[PDB]
Amino acid sequence: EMEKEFEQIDKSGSWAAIYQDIRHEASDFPCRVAKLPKNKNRNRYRDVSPFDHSRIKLHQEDNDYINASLIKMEEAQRSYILTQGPLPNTCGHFWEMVWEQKSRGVVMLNRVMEKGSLKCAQYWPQKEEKEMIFEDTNLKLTLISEDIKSYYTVRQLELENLTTQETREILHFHYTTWPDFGVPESPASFLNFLFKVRESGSLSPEHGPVVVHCSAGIGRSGTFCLADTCLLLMDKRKDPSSVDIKKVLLEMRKFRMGLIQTADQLRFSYLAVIEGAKFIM
Ligand SMILES: [Mg+2]
């Protein structure tokens, strides 16, 4: 059914029109905290800010600001934190958020360098014997293990709160093959990646929300959470054909602006859910 609507839009060449309609209907809420002068250097992009109502607050006595949003999907019973790729001065904040929110997994959908520019700070250690200390938030991060596959890398990290000496295992799911321009040709490897995150327990209710980022934390990040939520609803509902990807995306856009950045990303999301639903049969 969603598949019949897909072929209709394809045959009619109307992806841009459908996407502009979503842009026009999307919620608008204030971002007064993101726009305070003191926070200018905590934001990667002037045009991507968390809403005040859904932003993640840092606890540590100070400035509580990080560019991150809680996407809480009520019917699907799934939560996600969407955030920007860390900046050189926000790696300590990023790991503070992971600690305080009790996240088990971090999902990264970009490379540190793309199109010959830096899209995110090197916020995790690359060698077991070279751990990272974040002195501003009093956290230590160690690489425990790394498994490099053709389309993704999974890392086991140990995060230690140096104040209390408590340690937690964090799983880092790194999708390494999203192309520099456009979207993937096939959704097959992105779906395999999504099922690997699911299988880890990182998305399950006994943990805090999974942390998802790309460079801005709206485009690829949006695609990941939209695809996951739609596929869950199709398993949960008596009528799986009732799942309306445009309705789900507008719901998610109540919590963070700009999720899905292009008509091509919208088309790719439809493609991933349509293919993903056939695998869950
Ligand atoms: Mg070595």
Author numbering: 2 to 282
Structure paper excerpt:
Protein tyrosine phosphatase 1B (PTP1B) is an important regulatory enzyme for which minimally disruptive architectures for photocontrol could prove particularly informative. This enzyme, which catalyzes the hydrolytic dephosphorylation of tyrosine residues, helps regulate insulin, leptin, and epidermal growth factor signaling and participates in a diverse set of spatiotemporally complex signaling processes. In this study, we used a protein-based light switch to place the native allosteric regulatory system of PTP1B under optical control. We sought to place PTP1B under optical control by using LOV2, the light-sensitive domain from phototropin 1 of Avena sativa, to toggle the conformation of its α7 helix.
